[PDB]
Write an enzyme that holds these catalytic residues in place. Structure first.
Site, short mmCIF file in Angstrom:
data_model
loop_
_atom_site.label_atom_id
_atom_site.label_comp_id
_atom_site.label_asym_id
_atom_site.label_seq_id
_atom_site.Cartn_x
_atom_site.Cartn_y
_atom_site.Cartn_z
N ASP A 1 0.80 -1.21 0.00
CA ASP A 1 0.00 0.00 0.00
C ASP A 1 0.84 1.26 0.00
OD1 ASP A 1 -2.64 1.38 0.16
OD2 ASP A 1 -2.00 1.93 2.20
N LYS B 1 -3.50 11.48 11.83
CA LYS B 1 -3.75 10.92 10.51
C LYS B 1 -4.66 11.73 9.59
CE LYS B 1 -4.32 6.42 8.26
NZ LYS B 1 -3.17 6.80 7.36
N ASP C 1 -5.34 2.51 -3.54
CA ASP C 1 -3.96 2.90 -3.42
C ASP C 1 -3.17 1.71 -2.92
OD1 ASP C 1 -4.70 2.79 -0.70
OD2 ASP C 1 -3.07 4.20 -0.25
MG LIG Z 1 -3.11 4.14 1.96
#
Ligand SMILES: [Mg+2]
Ligand SMILES: [Mg+2]
EC number: 2.7.7.6
Length: 828
Positions: free
Chosen positions: A496, A576, A757
């Site tokens: 990822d 995040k 992704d």
């Molecule tokens: Mg990611």
DNA sequence: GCCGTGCGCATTCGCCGTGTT
DNA sequence: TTTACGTTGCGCACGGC
RNA sequence: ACACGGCGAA
């Protein structure tokens, strides 16, 4: 596969896969329609079986056809009652208290909420409801004015936040207590209501046609009932519960009709446009490279992981599941109420989180035993790729663990290595160089073999981050132990990207500063932009701890506010969302909501935050540290965002001659083509029918009064707030497609687990997927200047007329894109 | 036309079941 | 026919100078 | 195209 073979489905399928499966597919596609239709019915029934038909789509087209005709009587009545030189029909005054058409809706939405609620209903029944309904809306509703600008006072928090038939009137009835402006209300007694409704019902039969006849009884007309009913049947058959395929998906060779084979009235669309006009735009677009990706991806065979299904079936039933966050079977038996009554909230989530778990699990068992299954694919309008069926390789941990690739290969030396990297990743040991991940696995050998030998006894795997995917790995790992490197393995091993949003920004801007943070450069250590922002935040908190203002009155100042967070455990997780969304347009106020809901709100619920004394402040405070910290880190990106926003802004703008007031350039839609040839048209539009929100009964629209309409009107606001993420997301989706095509055409890879992704394959191909995702990343941004290309897209076509305050293309950086090839931790 | 007092809007996209006790 | 409180800052809009 | 809970995701 033959352009000609796009004939009669059954013939082509069987011809290619044998009459048995051919039948299973079609039977399956058909079942999806059936199931979907059921799901509708059940609902559409529970809808009227609880007086609420008017809401259902089926009656909406009827409502809009009559709702307007009411004024053509309601008002046509008033401006006629005024012709009488005496007393008014009582109803007059008892209906003028609220918006006319607002009454008409409350009327119709109630005449049916009874004509479909009970079976024996007359005029008294309706009227006692209509009139009864005219109130409340008249009461808690006439507060529209003489309270506006103070109504949205959020003193009700999203007003009637917690939905509810009478609830909206419950947690808002004694709330009327407050004196506020003026006050007091002389209830309509209990003898006016009927009268109020009577005229409504009469000027209903006088205007519409619904309520017909031959004290009497009310009945919905024949043609207006058979209508809502037809509308239903002709509406229940369009939301199929799509399921995976038992044969490869129908390749796409046009904007519609790919994925499933049964040729239906409503085939599948390639792009998930909201309007046929949008979809129709791709109708002739040449994009071979895009069709190639979607086809390659959807031809990936998957099989259910029988062993993971084995544990998942039982363990999800266990009173106390060992898996971190798995919705338990039952509730928590009554919530003091006090701050511990949030249960109504938490159990709401559980019961719904549980619904999908059982659905995913039922699909898994339904498809176990099949040699393989496939998932048709399509894209949202930015071009990102999504599986069409509810159950798919892009689901949660349990879903992902139930699914494994059907075509495996002897794992081999490299395959084994990456398998161990994957396992380390599934365990969470992933923010450390590869050697430390392998060590993690090797030094846990016995633990892994144990979970493999007896999962429901050695549940160390349920303890991990991706327990089911980790367990999935333990099985494969145990398998390699029992059989050696020759072991045929098909476990989708996931790579990822680390914060792909910034990666893409850094790449296209050649920003080395950003690039470094998101591993776009070779590095011994593994960069984690969230952890970075987390440290900076900690320096702050640490600093504010010993010397950073104090509390005034009650409002917690810093220091004490920082201590609280310090008491907590501010980690990469808290920062995040915000670090990731900043360059997308998320501002400090965004962060507040984010931190609040993402880490504070939940921490509170489980009781691990009994040291925040009012989430706010704690949140706004955190939101500010993150902003000041995230800002000193993500810059080129923000510059690039703002550049995009300026473009959207100047295209959305409407240019009028400074003197003549003439429109010189009409609002325009931002348009661009992704590197693999996927065209994206961003054109949000401000709603056509400016709807009026009537608390209680709900919300509804209405044909505009001013004869504007025309196209629909572009939403200049939305156009600017979305352009950044929409652009980047279309950029990642293109990279996803380019990688799928590249890995397939350059390395002969057939299996792909794609999650936007995240890029996955079987262990034996992991090494190549590893270079491929990096190679496409480099070819792309070394071969295209997406921002400069974008500019060449709107600079001419739609612009000027003074518009030339367009900021300059951001300055490029010194990030050597070819370094990405040697970056261990970039992944995507 | 040019700067104040107000109002509105918080990043974006996918998709599902419920509307209560 | 008994959960549910709550703040903080840039453009787009009039519009009297 | 507004709602709630979820999840996927950037
Ligand atoms: Mg990611
Ligand atoms: Mg994600």
């Amino acid at each position: 596969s033959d352009i000609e073979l796009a004939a009669i489905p059954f013939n082509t399928l069987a011809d290619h896969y044998g009459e048995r499966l051919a039948r299973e597919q079609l039977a399956l596609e058909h079942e999806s329609y059936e199931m979907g239709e059921a799901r509708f019915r059940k609902m559409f029934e529970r809808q009227l079986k609880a007086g609420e038909v008017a809401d259902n789509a089926a009656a909406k087209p009827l409502i809009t056809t009559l709702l307007p005709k009411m004024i053509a009587r309601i008002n046509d009545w008033f401006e006629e009652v005024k012709a009488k030189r005496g007393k008014r029909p009582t109803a007059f005054q008892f209906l003028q208290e609220i918006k006319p058409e607002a009454v008409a809706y409350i009327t119709i939405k109630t005449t049916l909420a009874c004509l479909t609620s009970a079976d024996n209903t007359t005029v008294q029944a309706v009227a006692s409801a209509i009139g009864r309904a005219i109130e409340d809306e008249a009461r808690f509703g006439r507060i529209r004015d003489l309270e506006a600008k103070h109504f949205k006072k959020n003193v009700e928090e999203q007003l009637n936040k917690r939905v509810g038939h009478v609830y909206k009137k419950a947690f808002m009835q004694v709330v009327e207590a407050d004196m506020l402006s003026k006050g007091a209300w002389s209830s309509w007694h209990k003898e006016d209501s009927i009268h109020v409704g009577v005229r409504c019902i009469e000027m209903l039969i006088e205007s519409t046609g619904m309520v017909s006849l031959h004290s009497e009884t009310i009945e919905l007309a024949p043609e207006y009932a058979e209508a809502i009913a037809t509308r239903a049947g002709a509406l229940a058959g369009i939301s199929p519960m799509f399921q995976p395929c038992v044969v490869p998906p129908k390749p796409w060779t046009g904007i519609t009709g790919g994925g499933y084979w049964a040729n239906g009235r409503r085939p599948l669309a390639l792009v998930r446009t909201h309007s046929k006009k949008a979809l129709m735009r791709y109708e002739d677009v040449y994009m071979p490279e895009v069709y190639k990706a979607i086809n390659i991806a959807q031809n990936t065979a998957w099989k259910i992981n029988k062993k993971v299904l084995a544990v998942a079936n039982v363990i999800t039933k266990w009173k106390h599941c060992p898996v971190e966050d798995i919705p338990a079977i039952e509730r928590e038996e009554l919530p003091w109420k006090r701050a511990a009554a949030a249960v109504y909230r938490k159990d709401k989530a559980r019961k719904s989180r549980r619904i999908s778990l059982e659905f995913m699990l039922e699909q898994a068992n339904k498809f176990a035993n099949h040699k393989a299954i496939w998932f048709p694919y399509n894209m949202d309008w930015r071009g990102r790729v999504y599986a069409v069926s509810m159950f798919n390789p892009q689901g949660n941990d349990m879903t992902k663990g139930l699914l494994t690739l059907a075509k495996g290969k002897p794992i081999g030396k490299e395959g084994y290595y990456w398998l161990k990297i994957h396992g380390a990743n599934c365990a969470g040991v992933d923010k450390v160089p590869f050697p430390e991940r392998i060590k993690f696995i090797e030094e846990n050998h016995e633990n892994i073999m144990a979970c493999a030998k007896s999962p429901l006894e050695n549940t160390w795997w349920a303890e991990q981050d991706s327990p089911f995917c980790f367990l999935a790995f333990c099985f494969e790992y145990a398998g390699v132990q029992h059989h050696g490197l020759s072991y045929n393995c098909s476990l989708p091993l996931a790579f990822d990207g680390s914060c792909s949003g910034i990666q893409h920004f850094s790449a296209m801007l050649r920003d080395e500063v950003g690039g470094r943070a998101v591993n776009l450069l070779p590095s011994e250590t593994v960069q984690d932009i969230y952890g970075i922002v987390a440290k900076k935040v900690n320096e702050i908190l640490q600093a504010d701890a010993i010397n950073g203002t104090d509390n005034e009155v009650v409002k917690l100042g810093t220091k004490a506010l920082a201590g609280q967070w310090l008491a907590y455990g501010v980690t990469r997780s808290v920062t995040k969302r915000s670090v990731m969304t900043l360059a997308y347009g998320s501002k400090e106020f965004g962060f507040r909501q984010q931190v609040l809901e993402d880490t504070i709100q939940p921490a509170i619920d489980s009781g691990k935050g009994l040291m925040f004394t009012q989430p706010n402040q704690a949140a706004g405070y955190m939101a500010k540290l993150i902003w000041e910290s995230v800002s000193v880190t993500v810059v080129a990106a923000v510059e690039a965002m703002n550049w995009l926003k300026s473009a959207a802004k100047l295209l959305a703008a409407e240019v009028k001659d400074k003197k003549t007031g003439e429109i010189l350039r009409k609002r325009c839609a931002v348009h661009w083509v992704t590197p693999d040839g996927f065209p994206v048209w961003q054109e949000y539009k401000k709603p056509i029918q400016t709807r009026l929100n009537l608390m209680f009964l709900g919300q509804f629209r209405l044909q505009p009064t001013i004869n504007t309409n025309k196209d629909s009107e572009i939403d200049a606001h939305k156009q600017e707030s979305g352009i950044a993420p929409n652009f980047v997301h279309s950029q990642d989706g293109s990279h996803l497609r380019k990688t799928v095509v590249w890995a397939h055409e350059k390395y002969g890879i057939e299996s792909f687990a794609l999650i936007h992704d995240s890029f996955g394959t079987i262990p034996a191909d992991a090494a190549n997927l590893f270079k491929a995702v990096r190679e496409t990343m480099v070819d792309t941004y070394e071969s295209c200047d997406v921002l400069a290309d974008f500019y060449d897209q709107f600079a001419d076509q739609l612009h000027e007329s003074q518009l030339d305050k367009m900021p300059a293309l951001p300055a490029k950086g010194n990030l050597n894109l070819r370094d990405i090839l040697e970056s261990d931790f970039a992944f995507a």
